[PDB]
Amino acid sequence: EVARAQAALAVNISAARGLQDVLRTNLGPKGTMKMLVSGAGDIKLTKDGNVLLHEMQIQHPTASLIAKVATAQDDITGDGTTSNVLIIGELLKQADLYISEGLHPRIITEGFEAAKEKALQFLEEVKVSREMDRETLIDVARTSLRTKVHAELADVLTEAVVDSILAIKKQDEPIDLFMIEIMEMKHKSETDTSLIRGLVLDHGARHPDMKKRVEDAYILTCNVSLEYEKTEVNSGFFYKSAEEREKLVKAERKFIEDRVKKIIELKRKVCGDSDKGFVVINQKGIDPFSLDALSKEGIVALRRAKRRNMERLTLACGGVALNSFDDLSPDCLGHAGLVYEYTLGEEKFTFIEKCNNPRSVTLLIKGPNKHTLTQIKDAVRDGLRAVKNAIDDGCVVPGAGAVEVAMAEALIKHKPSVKGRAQLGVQAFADALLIIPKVLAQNSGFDLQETLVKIQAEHSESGQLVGVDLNTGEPMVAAEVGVWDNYCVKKQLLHSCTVIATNILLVDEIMRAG
Amino acid sequence: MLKEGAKHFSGLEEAVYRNIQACKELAQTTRTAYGPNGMNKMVINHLEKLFVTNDAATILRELEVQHPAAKMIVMASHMQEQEVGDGTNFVLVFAGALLELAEELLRIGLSVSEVIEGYEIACRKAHEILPNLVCCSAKNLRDIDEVSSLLRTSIMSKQYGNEVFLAKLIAQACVSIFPDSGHFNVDNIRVCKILGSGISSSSVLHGMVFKKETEGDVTSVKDAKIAVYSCPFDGMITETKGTVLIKTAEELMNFSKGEENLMDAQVKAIADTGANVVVTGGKVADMALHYANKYNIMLVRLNSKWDLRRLCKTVGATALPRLTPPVLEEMGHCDSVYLSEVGDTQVVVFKHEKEDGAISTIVLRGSTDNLMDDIERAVDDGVNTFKVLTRDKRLVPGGGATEIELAKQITSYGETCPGLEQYAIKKFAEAFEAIPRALAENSGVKANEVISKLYAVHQEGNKNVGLDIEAEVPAVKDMLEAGILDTYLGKYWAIKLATNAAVTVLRVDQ
Amino acid sequence: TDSSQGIPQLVSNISACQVIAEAVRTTLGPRGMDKLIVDGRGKATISNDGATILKLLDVVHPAAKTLVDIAKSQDAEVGDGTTSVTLLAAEFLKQVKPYVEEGLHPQIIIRAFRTATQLAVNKIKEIAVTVKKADKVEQRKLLEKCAMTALSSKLISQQKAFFAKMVVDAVMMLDDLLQLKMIGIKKVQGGALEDSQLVAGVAFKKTFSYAGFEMQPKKYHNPKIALLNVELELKAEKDNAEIRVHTVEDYQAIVDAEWNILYDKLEKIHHSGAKVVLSKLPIGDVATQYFADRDMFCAGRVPEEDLKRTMMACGGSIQTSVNALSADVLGRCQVFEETQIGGERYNFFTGCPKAKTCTFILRGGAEQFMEETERSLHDAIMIVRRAIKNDSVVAGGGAIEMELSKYLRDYSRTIPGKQQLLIGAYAKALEIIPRQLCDNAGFDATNILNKLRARHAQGGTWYGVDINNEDIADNFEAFVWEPAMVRINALTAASEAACLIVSVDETIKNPR
């Protein structure tokens, strides 16, 4: 029961070939949005290449392999994963023509090795230094978001993404791994995305309007319960006699009473005036009784907040997370410069913003709570990973398949290693790249050959990375428009494509396994 | 496929052809709908009754489709259902019509992505010329004729036989308690079916209507706050039975004595706490009744699920299971509690007088509950069209009289712009033409005649057609001056959401 | 979840209607062609009007269900003409069915059904003759000639006049309903069929003979009636049971102690005032001992419905306990007489203080004579009762329907386009009901229909088909007199039922 030799290579090429179709209509902004109901029956709206592979049901070994390598690329850049598949497919196609005439797989592979070294050095030549200014971050931000959503909604998400990265310089990280808290708001339109500097809280107080503007906020984030009702428990289960359970109910309620009292003593010790407020965020309930008492003192107490809110507060605010209340100095408690409560939709979200010592920004996406609000979540996700790269590298090139024609031109002309063995894979490598620009033209409705001869000639005359204006599907200078690509995007399509190709190319048997 | 992975049910041939043909079938239930019609669609679902509707929301939710393209638009229709009333049908026919026109473009050699682009453009130009099609508007909301003209269009879309009485009735019974300028409530107005009597015998009552009969004495106090309990009586003690009758004779004595003394305490706790109207969804025993006569509490025999639901939303109530005495926490905003018979059946009447959080009820009287379910669609859309949150609602010509106007402007505009975009812009004109086609089909004559003769009269902003004989042959009727008007906001969200829905679904191929 | 749509889908819905319209096709008189409908519960079923059985059917179409529902609406209001509504609605749609193919799919249809229905009702009401009860007639003699109309059809000879004048007397006295429910007619075996008896009050068909049934009294002049939905017998309270044995007296004691409990039950109600005990549950052999010896009357095994009539008329009330209960749960009469007529013992309660049941007692002494009398007297009581309520009376026989069909033929000329076609189907549909009367009388139905139109174009009279004589002639001058109002209801219900089905042609079903 075996597919050997020609039969083994045949299976891989056929699969790559059907797949390629799908993920070209995800490529750049001119690609098309996709939904799954084929993954589980429920309604997902997604426009990323890696993600779409996970959501579906993949049984084919070649599709699965491409999805695995995809996973690594998706973490680092989150862009170019729409591209990964396209370059793989064509790369195989080239190989196939030669094999069918009469060619060995191994000579193909050698010329891939030669191909890869030259191609990577080309990145280094051609790279253009950029600043680290806002303007330059706007253009990595806008083009990457433009991939993953529309042009209309993408321009709104552009603002939110860029201010966050500027704030992350202040912490002096050269990376991003915080300021990625995505919080959702309840709304009747999605054409707003708001930036909130500090944190946002899922639920607020159950009693409205305690003091919904806090001038001077001293945040105690706690998580012990100040509500546990009147239920008869013992160790949290029923016991044989009524009375034994009851005795514990008294002491438990009594414990809660003293902890609510510590909020009353804490306000004098830290505050002392109502010229200052006091913030409580409890991830567990608080009695309706306890809120009225706190409220008149000029304390806002929040109930039913999450564990994710708590960890974030402790970083940004400089707060603490304690399993007790007690009488604590303001030295221990974090401070936020401002607190405001903004009610919109059917759920009201207390904002705790202008934190001192931040390290977390929240990008607050408004939306109707459809799959569209999940669509801007995953657009925004990979737009953060994009502008992260700009901070990583120093150099960002103009894209839109500008880079890729330039690199292909460099290979066709000379042998990179000066041997004929290398040369057979090298042709194959160069034409594989050309898929990315030509196909933006194809989506739009502009013949593919016409853009290749033009785009390539204008490189030769100038020394400009001339690109594609997506909408016409005709060439234009990708630099001015803002269609740009990071060093990391064009590096990671190159590495993934080579490694994945050479293990499928070098099959000679596929034999089933339990 | 070529793959034993990468699952799709759409894509290639099936995106282009199969998706469109499916949208077309959903939207066939709205090419018999929207404005003048005599269509009725019966749908069953094992609800122990027949459900008659000419509303898109109930048709759509019933009907399940296994494709994302057809399934996605149902959500857009619901969205327009929340923000506004009638025009729900118009949202689905538009998206569905545009998609039929789209597939023809794909055939010729035009690409998907420019066509997608040209709709966003056409939608923006159509909205921009839309507040310039205002021809009439309200200024007073306490005046019954200016409100009723608006209402009328919602009702019309249902049946063309019940337009006159109802459109007057809702405005008479008030949906003008709120200022409707920042704030409006629609769960503090319900449509309450009273079985019995004719549907021209449908009446005005102010504040909460519950069908269930009143027992005991009736209150008229202003200390009457509502307490709601799903089941506060079931017998305070349940029997076990050992002689398979009772367990047994001396014990039966005690089971009754303990019920009567526990119910005394429970019903006296209600009396004391300031709850002087108790809603019982349980069972009124003699013992329970005997107590409530002494304390002076209006007693509501029974409730069903539907009756409990309206108490929890309006009151700020909870419906607690009970057999151990409780106290107030349901509270209420209702002072007065009166008693008045509607339908010759004893009905419990709640009222208080205020603007915000104030209550009203469009209450109906009907031969059967089926006849009342359709009427209800007309009425609930008539409350949801009221919501605009202004007092100048900027009324634009209802009934599909705007549609031809939009179509003429858009086709000319298309010519001016170059490239592939324009063809989508032209198609965008002919999607509006869907509405004049459906009115023609019920009217009894072909499409060619109506669209041409509306175009012939040029810019009018009144022209639309009915079910009549006037609606057929000269194909000219005045639906500006018949007082057929709809709101600017209702047409806005209808066109907006529909263009957004048509673009996302045309993109799919997975 | 199923969805079906189309012009062939519309055609489906109508086709279903025809099937139910066939079930009820003819039942106007006593001819047609029946098949006994025996259920899967092991019950055999027939009725006297074919709409009854039709109600029981569960239709798997919602469109067909509408036509079921209008049956239920007619039956509750008038109690007659229920059949008629099915036939008109279905038939209207039948001649429309091939018109849909041609182009009559559009919703315009609903508008046409309203114009035809609104004119037609008005023409009945105007043509109908409004006649007092004191015009030049007794109230009983107007309703005598109307009650005859049912009686002549089947199948009772010359006694029909006599029975008619009798059957009226019960209805006037009660009148306040349009249903026969509070009247009824009770068959009695044996006795004269050359006279029958009108009894004011209630009666019982049969009480079974028990041990000392003739040793109980049969006559009272102030009978006070205990209505019991309970029983005492050997299996309701025991009279056999285990005891300890060590002396003979133990055995005596147990049977003795049991006989006491059963004796308590009659005594407690007798001391309130009772002397008449009426029960629909059985009374045994041990039970009847105490009664026979006390010289207090007992009755067991009398119909459940009949016991419930006894409550209304005598002002008695239901019990569930016969121990220690008031005397205000009792009713009275002034006359209790027991006369055995034929093979069955007959209890007559009459002299009733508020007299909210009066009922005709029909004595024949067969099964053959009596079921056909009862069948005719059921519909007699319907005609006379409804003649008090609407005092406008028109010719029946389908004679007036033939005139509407004339009238509507005229109208179709000035009414335009797609609506005209709809009107021509209305007119053709009105002739179906009389066609079946022609099938019942025994004629060629199509030959006949045409002759009645001739005298609706040569005088506009009352010419229609008789089944009340089995001939063709004026029906007003044949005293086939039934209210205007049966016809008013049947038109409006038939249009209403119709418009719904032709409108639906898109059915969404869920087998969830």
Please tell me the distance from the alpha carbon of residue A111 to that of residue A94, in angstroms, as a whole number.
Answer: 13
Which residues, 6+ apart, have CB-to-CB distance to B492 below 8 Å? B127, B130
Say whether the A–C interface has 3 or more Cβ pairs within 8 Å: no
Exposure string over A157-175, b if 16+ CB within 10 A, otherwise e: bbbbbbbbbeebeeeeeee
Count how many residues are written for chain A: 514
B88 has binding-site annotation? yes
Please tell me the distance from the alpha carbon of residue A429 to that of residue A412, in angstroms, as a whole number.
Answer: 9
* Cβ pairs B/C, distance under 8 A: 75
Question: Among all residues of chain B, which has the CA nearest to that of C417?
Answer: B469
Q: Which letter does DSSP use for residue A267 in this model?
A: I
Residues in chain C with CB shorter than 8 Å from the CB of B367 are 73
The packing angle between helices A61-76 and A487-505, to 10°, is 160
Instruction: Give yes or no for a contact between B215 and B297, defined as CB atoms under 8 angstroms apart.
Output: no
Please tell me the distance from the alpha carbon of residue C261 to that of residue A34, in angstroms, as a whole number.
Answer: 85
Q: Do A56 and B7 touch (CB under 8 A)?
A: yes
The H or E element that residue C133 is part of is: none
Tokens describing residue B406 = 């939009």
Please tell me the distance from the alpha carbon of residue A447 to that of residue A220, in angstroms, as a whole number.
Answer: 64
Breaks after residues in chain A, judged by C–N over 2.5 Å: none
A400 has binding-site annotation? yes
Count how many residues are written for chain C: 512
Please tell me the distance from the alpha carbon of residue A88 to that of residue A85, in angstroms, as a whole number.
Answer: 5
* Residues facing residue B338 across a β-bridge: B349
Q: For residue A140, how many other CB atoms are within 10 A of its CB? A: 27
The answer, for B38 touching chain C at a CB cutoff of 8 Å, is yes
Which residues, 6+ apart, have CB-to-CB distance to C163 below 8 Å? C151, C156, C196, C362, C373, C377
Tokens describing residue B179 = 């200022």
- In angstroms and rounded to an integer, the radius of gyration of the C-alpha atoms of chain A is 29
CA B414 to chain centre: 36
Question: What sign does the CA torsion over A408, A413, A416, A417 have?
Answer: positive
Among chain A, residues having any CB pair with chain B shorter than 8 Å are: 14-15, 17-19, 21-22, 25, 30, 32-39, 41, 43, 45, 52-53, 56-60, 62-64, 152, 188, 368, 370, 443-445, 471
The answer, for C414 touching chain B at a CB cutoff of 8 Å, is no
**The tokens 């990577």 sit on which residue?**
A120
Burial of C471 (0-12, 13-18, 19+ CB in 10 A): exposed
Please tell me the distance from the alpha carbon of residue B6 to that of residue C418, in angstroms, as a whole number.
Answer: 55
Residue A208's alpha-carbon distances to A204, A295, A319, B331, in angstroms, are: 8, 10, 24, 18
C227 phi and psi angles, rounded to 5 deg: -100, 120
Query: Catalytic positions of A, please?
Result: 48, 81-82, 382
Instruction: Give yes or no for a contact between C394 and C129, defined as CB atoms under 8 angstroms apart.
Output: yes
Please tell me the distance from the alpha carbon of residue A347 to that of residue A367, in angstroms, as a whole number.
Answer: 13
Closest Cα to residue B169, out of B438, B430, B352, B365? Answer: B365
Q: For residue C242, how many other CB atoms are within 10 A of its CB? A: 6
Which residues, 6+ apart, have CB-to-CB distance to A403 below 8 Å? A126, A397, A465, A485, A490
Q: What SS3 class is residue A399?
A: coil
Which residues, 6+ apart, have CB-to-CB distance to C104 below 8 Å? C96, C418, C421, C422
Q: Do C506 and B469 touch (CB under 8 A)?
A: no
Which chains have at least 3 CB atom pairs separated by less than 8 Å from chain C?
B
Please tell me the distance from the alpha carbon of residue C63 to that of residue C22, in angstroms, as a whole number.
Answer: 17
Which residues, 6+ apart, have CB-to-CB distance to C375 below 8 Å? C30, C48, C154
Please tell me the distance from the alpha carbon of residue C258 to that of residue C253, in angstroms, as a whole number.
Answer: 9
B157 has binding-site annotation? yes
Q: What SS3 class is residue A237?
A: coil
* Cβ pairs A/B, distance under 8 A: 100
Which chains have at least 3 CB atom pairs separated by less than 8 Å from chain A?
B
Which chains have at least 3 CB atom pairs separated by less than 8 Å from chain B?
A, C
Please tell me the distance from the alpha carbon of residue A29 to that of residue C244, in angstroms, as a whole number.
Answer: 101
Instruction: Give yes or no for a contact between C200 and C174, defined as CB atoms under 8 angstroms apart.
Output: no
Q: For residue A126, how many other CB atoms are within 10 A of its CB? A: 17
Alpha helices, H only, A240-336: 242-266, 288-297, 307-317
Q: For residue A257, how many other CB atoms are within 10 A of its CB? A: 11
Residue C472's alpha-carbon distances to A49, C145, C150, C401, C455, in angstroms, are: 87, 19, 17, 15, 11
CA A145 to chain centre: 10
Calculate how close chain A gets to B61, using CA atoms only, in Å: 15
Q: What does the DSSP assignment read for C89-156?
A: HHHHHHHHHHHHHHH--STTHHHHHHHHHHHHHHHHHHHSEE--SSSSS-HHHHHHHHHHHHHHHSS-
The answer, for B106 touching chain C at a CB cutoff of 8 Å, is no
| Nearest-5° Cα angle at C271, C267 to C274 | 85
The answer, for C305 touching chain B at a CB cutoff of 8 Å, is no
* Residues facing residue A344 across a β-bridge: A347
Q: Which of C83, C86, C149, C288 is catalytic?
A: C83
Which residues, 6+ apart, have CB-to-CB distance to A289 below 8 Å? none
Q: Please name the amino acid found at residue A138.
A: I
Q: Please name the amino acid found at residue A359.
A: R
Q: What SS3 class is residue C105?
A: coil
Burial of A122 (0-12, 13-18, 19+ CB in 10 A): buried
Q: Do B444 and C106 touch (CB under 8 A)?
A: yes
C153 has binding-site annotation? yes
Tokens describing residue C316 = 């008695």
Resolution in A: 7.7
Q: Do C507 and B63 touch (CB under 8 A)?
A: no
Q: What SS3 class is residue C208?
A: coil
Q: What does the DSSP assignment read for C370-409?
A: HHHHHHHHHHHHHHHHHHHH--EEEE-TTHHHHHHHHHHH
Q: What SS3 class is residue B398?
A: coil
First-to-final CA distance of chain A: 13
Instruction: Give yes or no for a contact between B118 and B421, defined as CB atoms under 8 angstroms apart.
Output: yes
Instruction: Give yes or no for a contact between A353 and A198, defined as CB atoms under 8 angstroms apart.
Output: yes
Residues in chain A with CB shorter than 8 Å from the CB of B79 are 188, 368, 370
Please tell me the distance from the alpha carbon of residue B323 to that of residue C488, in angstroms, as a whole number.
Answer: 55
Q: What does the DSSP assignment read for C335-377?
A: EEEEEEETTEEEEEEE--SS----EEEEE-SSSHHHHHHHHHH
Residues in chain B with CB shorter than 8 Å from the CB of C503 are 38-40
Q: Please name the amino acid found at residue A55.
A: E
B211 has binding-site annotation? no
Residue of B45, B63, B443 lying closest to C3 (CB–CB) = B63
Residue of A30, A37, A152 lying closest to B113 (CB–CB) = A30
**The tokens 């410069």 sit on which residue?**
A337
Q: Do C108 and B25 touch (CB under 8 A)?
A: no
Q: Do B72 and A25 touch (CB under 8 A)?
A: no
Is residue C359 part of the annotated active site? The answer reads no
Tokens describing residue C368 = 């053959």
**The tokens 């007639």 sit on which residue?**
C137
Residues in chain B with CB shorter than 8 Å from the CB of C65 are 50
Question: Among all residues of chain B, which has the CA nearest to that of C65?
Answer: B50
Instruction: Give yes or no for a contact between B161 and B146, defined as CB atoms under 8 angstroms apart.
Output: no
Please tell me the distance from the alpha carbon of residue A350 to that of residue B26, in angstroms, as a whole number.
Answer: 42
Q: Which letter does DSSP use for residue C455 in this model?
A: T
Q: What SS3 class is residue A339?
A: strand
First-to-final CA distance of chain B: 13
Which residues, 6+ apart, have CB-to-CB distance to A503 below 8 Å? A65
Please tell me the distance from the alpha carbon of residue A34 to that of residue B235, in angstroms, as a whole number.
Answer: 59
Which residues, 6+ apart, have CB-to-CB distance to A73 below 8 Å? A50, A80, A81, A84, A492, A493, A496
